[PDB]
Amino acid sequence: PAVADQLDSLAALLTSRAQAVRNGAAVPPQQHVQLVKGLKDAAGLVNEAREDLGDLMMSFVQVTALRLLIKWKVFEAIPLEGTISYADVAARVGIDVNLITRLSWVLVATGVLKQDGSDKIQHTARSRPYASRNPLSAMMIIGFDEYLPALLAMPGYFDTYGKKEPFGEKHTVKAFSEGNPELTVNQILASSPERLGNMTLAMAAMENMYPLSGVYDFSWVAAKAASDSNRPLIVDVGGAKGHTLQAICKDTPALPIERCVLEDLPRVIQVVKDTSDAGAQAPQLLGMDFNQEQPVKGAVVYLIRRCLHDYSDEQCVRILGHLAAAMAADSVLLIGETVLTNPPSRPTAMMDILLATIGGKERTIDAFGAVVGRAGLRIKGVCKQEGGDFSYIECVKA
Amino acid sequence: AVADQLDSLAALLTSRAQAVRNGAAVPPQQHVQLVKGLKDAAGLVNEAREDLGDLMMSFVQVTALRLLIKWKVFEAIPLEGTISYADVAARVGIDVNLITRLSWVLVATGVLKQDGSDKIQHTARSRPYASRNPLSAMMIIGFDEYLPALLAMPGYFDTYGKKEPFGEKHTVKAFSEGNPELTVNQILASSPERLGNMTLAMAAMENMYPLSGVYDFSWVAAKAASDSNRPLIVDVGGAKGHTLQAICKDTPALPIERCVLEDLPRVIQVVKDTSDQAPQLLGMDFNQEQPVKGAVVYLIRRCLHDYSDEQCVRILGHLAAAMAADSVLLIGETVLTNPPSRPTAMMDILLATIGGKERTIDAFGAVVGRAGLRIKGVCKQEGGDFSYIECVKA
Ligand SMILES: [Cl-]
């Protein structure tokens, strides 16, 4: 049938990458992602129904072994190079060596760890990313702690609140899973500085993924900066750090950073000015709110990155409607979000359901167009990034 | 180095391609070496962030499966052909946007197939979850009962100690459900086919090895003629009675009527209701002394891995006391290799949530010797880790 020639093309794709890595030739990101998808596509076609369920069960146990070994700092006690006995690992962390062995055996079977002989363990390239508390290990931590319990609570949640798309800050699946559906996600996290800190580090790991500078041509904004010496240039709505504004103005020095506006919650802006060099050139820091008018009028470019996916279409129309009101005829709005294909890929579909636990969602270009059009805007273009669906949707006033 | 691993996998996919074209089965060893490698290639090609994504998806994929099963979505999809998301939504009376987002998960993973922009259809990987069968029961069990125990483990070890969980009391499962003072089987006796979902589901982890073609029972038949009243085969915790009928239909002069099926009274009562020629049925608790004395062969299959080492010592100790000098005890269990395989290591941590574990042949030899027994031999499954440990009185 058709399952037979899917294997043939992945085979040919594998030979092409084999000779490529033989020649040391660099691999474009789109080729990397196609091989990643092709390998996983074949694994489901080759697996029977029982093997699929067995694989899903192993990933669960594997994630549980990763979380426990991260929490117990077992990866950190294993040297980055060389081997070490299970008993020595157990002495370094003060834990029963059966528990260490049985949990490490899980990661030995899946290739995350490699066992040497009958009782010695070593790191691999797949386990060193968890040998410390870092951006990626934080993502696993908050994934296990903050989102998996909400996935489990979903059958009971939809029975309680109705089988509809979860939207809004209260009565989220996450809060329902915590036992306090009347509390927002931020209220639950503010009660624990450790849980907040891991989420901060984990979220900072994803804001850094697809840079705006270098993939969007700001040369036309340079012309606007010269004609009007006083109009604001770039406004980063919800820009969190100011990292993106620094990158844009560094690569395009025609845009002075002090002519750009960084906008976020007052508590987020307080952190920025708390840690920033007071003697260095900095953008305008403005404490604002999504639901109210955009304070900066007539700016050349407005950015709203990784924000609209937290809210429903109706909230998104309000947010975009405030921007459209403040925008000039020549203004441009850049929406930085994942743009789902139909049907969507595995990592973006996975993200879409995770966002449902907190009242968000991912959107196709069709859903973005409807929300954009209802806010008095229109889509002008889409800048899709290599090896993924994260894009900058260029919008303009209708 | 890394290059020829891709070529070897590529060559395996070439071999697999022609055979599925002709409807050919491919050797099982060739299927095994293709499933592996496909995993190993994924482990080498995936970036760390992509591998973390794969693991997180498994949880979202199981949640989409669970929700669409509970909502009768697989029941509303036609057998053959496609159906629009709007129609599926109207049949089950659910928000079409919610139906589409959850089905997109299964479409992306290959469980479901999307035709065009808005139409969906069954595949060979979705059909088992449209009905009540061991496979669909297991996945429901994995979500409803095993998954909460796994998520509660970081907290469980924070309250009881970062040590091996053991015993029927204060299990991770009982902890995860908010009643740590309950035992696992009190929890399953909450509703009668909450246990019934479990006994149906254990046919999905039922990688069945028939034992009859594994162990030579001919010497037992010779004992049957030498002692006309002696019990022959006692199946301790045999539940079904499938093993006993398989052995007796396959071994001549080993009558089923001279064998005993032993399990819990409530299990024995279910057997008698569905059975009708037959072995002796005995309601029992294998934590207490064994009533049928001096049987030629005692069987205990897939029971010891649910319990701690000391509890298995007591269980086996009752059997040893009842055995004659020529009696044989066959332990049907997974025998862990060091290091273990993927399914045996996965099952090892699942059993930890109920105070059990999988054991090597050394760990088995330790508990066997504490009961008054010694290992006489091991009959191993080819292509797996399930074994039959032949034990005799020490
Ligand atoms: Cl062990």
- Does residue B378 share a domain with residue B244? yes
Chain A residues lying within 8 Å of B66, measured CB to CB? 154-155
CB burial of residue B132 (10 Å; 0-12, 13-18, 19+): exposed
CA distance A54 to B207: 12
A296 neighbors A232 (Cβ within 8 angstroms): yes
Domain with residue A98: its CATH number is 1.10.10.10
Enumerate residues preceding breaks in chain B (C to N > 2.5 Å).
276
Domain around A151: 135-207
Report the chain A residue with the minimal C-alpha distance to residue B156: A68
- Does residue B260 share a domain with residue B181? no
Contact A60 B108 (CB under 8 A): no
Q: How far is B247 from chain A (nearest CA, A)?
A: 26
Task: Return all residues near B227 (Cβ < 8 A) that are at least 6 apart.
Answer: none
- Does residue B151 share a domain with residue B108? no
Following CA atoms A142, A143, A145, A146 in sequence, which dihedral angle do they give, to the nearest 10 degrees?
Answer: 80
Nearest to A155 among B7, B67, B111 (CB): B67
Let me know if residue B58 belongs to a domain.
Answer: yes
Mutate to test the interface with B, among A6, A9, A14, A97 (most CBs of B within 10 A): A14
3-class secondary structure, A327: coil
DSSP for A90-106?
Answer: HHHHT--HHHHHHHHHH
- Does residue B262 share a domain with residue B357? yes
Cα A363-B94-B112 angle, rounded to 5 deg: 65
Give the tokens for residue B341. 């395989």
CA distance B320 to B312: 12
- Does residue B370 share a domain with residue B242? yes
Let me know if residue B211 belongs to a domain.
Answer: no
Let me know if residue A259 belongs to a domain.
Answer: yes
Give the tokens for residue B69. 């099963």
CA distance B135 to B251: 31
Contact B346 A52 (CB under 8 A): no
- Does residue A192 share a domain with residue A262? no
User: Taking the CA of residue A30 as centre, how many other CA atoms within 13 Å lie in the half-sphere pointing to its CB?
Assistant: 4
Task: Return all residues near B115 (Cβ < 8 A) that are at least 6 apart.
Answer: B82, B121
Q: For residue A91, how far is the Cα from the chain centroid?
A: 37
**Cα dist. A355→A12, A49, A268, B101 in Å?**
37, 29, 22, 11
DSSP A147: I
Rounded to the nearest angstrom, the distance between the alpha carbon of A63 and the centre of ligand 1 is 20
Give the tokens for residue B361. 């042949």
CA distance B263 to B303: 11
- Does residue A227 share a domain with residue A188? no
B26 neighbors A37 (Cβ within 8 angstroms): no
- Does residue A235 share a domain with residue A88? no
Report the chain B residue with the minimal C-alpha distance to residue A205: B49
Task: Return all residues near B153 (Cβ < 8 A) that are at least 6 apart.
Answer: A64, A67, A68, B172, B353
| Helix residue ranges, H only, chain B | 2-21, 28-45, 48-70, 73-76, 85-92, 96-109, 134-141, 147-151, 153-160, 172-176, 184-188, 194-201, 218-226, 242-250, 265-274, 309-322, 342-352, 361-370
CA distance A162 to A298: 43
- Does residue B167 share a domain with residue B120? no
Give the tokens for residue A67. 């979380």
Selected residues 25-64 of chain A with any CB under 8 Å from a CB in chain B: 32, 35-36, 39-47, 49-64
CA distance A368 to A338: 10
CB burial of residue A294 (10 Å; 0-12, 13-18, 19+): buried
DSSP A216: B
Contact A126 B48 (CB under 8 A): yes
Q: How many residues are recorded in chain A?
A: 398
CB burial of residue B96 (10 Å; 0-12, 13-18, 19+): middle
Q: How far is B39 from chain A (nearest CA, A)?
A: 8
Looking only at the bridges linking them, the beta strands covering B328-336 and B386-393 are antiparallel
Contact A136 B352 (CB under 8 A): no
Task: Return all residues near A29 (Cβ < 8 A) that are at least 6 apart.
Answer: A386, A387, A388
Contact A44 B95 (CB under 8 A): no
B346 neighbors A58 (Cβ within 8 angstroms): yes
| Helix residue ranges, H only, chain A | 3-22, 29-46, 49-71, 74-77, 86-93, 97-109, 135-142, 148-152, 154-161, 173-178, 185-190, 193-207, 219-227, 243-251, 266-275, 313-326, 346-356, 365-374
Task: Return all residues near B13 (Cβ < 8 A) that are at least 6 apart.
Answer: A7, A8, A10, A11, A14, A42, B34
Contact B13 A11 (CB under 8 A): yes
Tell me which residue of A292, A157, A7, A28 sits closest to B67, measured CA to CA: A157
Cα dihedral across residues A84, A75, A81, A25: positive or negative: positive
A187 neighbors A177 (Cβ within 8 angstroms): no
Report the chain B residue with the minimal C-alpha distance to residue A388: B50
Residue recorded with tokens 């594994």: B214
A60 neighbors B139 (Cβ within 8 angstroms): no
Give the tokens for residue B386. 């399930």
Nearest to B55 among A15, A59, A344 (CB): A59
Is the bond preceding residue B343 a cis peptide, omega within 30 degrees? Answer: no
Task: Return all residues near A120 (Cβ < 8 A) that are at least 6 apart.
Answer: A83, A84, A85, A86
B150 part of contact set with chain A, CB < 8 Å: yes
Determined by X-ray
A-B CB pairs within 8 A amount to 272
CA distance A178 to A4: 47
- Does residue B370 share a domain with residue B247? yes
A342 part of contact set with chain B, CB < 8 Å: yes
**How many other C-beta atoms can be found within 10 angstroms of the C-beta atom of residue B361?**
16
Q: How many domains does chain B have?
A: 3
Measure the N-to-C terminal CA separation of chain B; round to a whole number of Å: 52
CA distance A207 to A30: 21
B384 part of contact set with chain A, CB < 8 Å: no
Domain with residue B289: its CATH number is 3.40.50.150
Q: How far is A263 from chain B (nearest CA, A)?
A: 29
Looking only at the bridges linking them, the beta strands covering A332-340 and A301-305 are parallel
Give the tokens for residue A274. 């708390």
Let me know if residue B361 belongs to a domain.
Answer: yes
Tell me which residue of A261, A265, A266 sits closest to A249, measured CA to CA: A261
CA distance B48 to A137: 10
CA distance A396 to A383: 15
CA distance A70 to A65: 8
Selected residues 234-293 of chain A with any CB under 8 Å from a CB in chain B: none
CA distance B345 to B288: 30
CA distance A388 to A28: 12
Residue recorded with tokens 């984990």: A202
Rounded to the nearest angstrom, the distance between the alpha carbon of B327 and the centre of ligand 1 is 29
Task: Walk across the sheet containing A113-116 and list its strands.
Answer: A83-85, A120-123, A113-116
Task: Return all residues near A20 (Cβ < 8 A) that are at least 6 apart.
Answer: A27
Task: Return all residues near A259 (Cβ < 8 A) that are at least 6 apart.
Answer: A225, A232, A233, A283
Residue recorded with tokens 């990292």: A243
Residue recorded with tokens 């027994």: B373
Give the tokens for residue B394. 């020490």
Let me know if residue A172 belongs to a domain.
Answer: yes
CA distance A86 to A78: 9
CA distance A62 to A126: 13
Q: How far is B201 from chain A (nearest CA, A)?
A: 12
Question: Left, alpha or beta for A344 (phi > 0: left; psi -120 to 50: alpha)?
Answer: beta
Q: How far is A278 from chain B (nearest CA, A)?
A: 36
**Cα dist. A62→A109, A140, B147 in Å?**
9, 12, 12
Let me know if residue B94 belongs to a domain.
Answer: yes
Let me know if residue B209 belongs to a domain.
Answer: no
Measure the N-to-C terminal CA separation of chain A; round to a whole number of Å: 49
Give the tokens for residue B7. 């070529």
Which domain-ending residue is among B201, B226, B244?
A: B201
Active site residues of B: 305
CA distance A273 to B77: 56
Which domain-ending residue is among B130, B147, B170?
A: B130
**Cα dist. A122→A39, A307, B40, B221, B264 in Å?**
26, 41, 18, 52, 46
CB burial of residue A84 (10 Å; 0-12, 13-18, 19+): middle
Nearest to A36 among B46, B150, B163 (CB): B46
Let me know if residue A28 belongs to a domain.
Answer: no
Cα dihedral across residues B50, B55, B58, B61: positive or negative: negative
CA distance B71 to B283: 39
- Does residue B329 share a domain with residue B284? yes
CA distance B222 to B213: 18
Chain B residues lying within 8 Å of A56, measured CB to CB? 58, 61-62, 139, 142
CA distance B20 to B27: 12
A80 neighbors A129 (Cβ within 8 angstroms): no
Which domain-ending residue is among A94, A112, A131?
A: A131
Is the bond preceding residue A347 a cis peptide, omega within 30 degrees? Answer: no
Chain A residues lying within 8 Å of B64, measured CB to CB? 353
- Does residue A369 share a domain with residue A274? yes
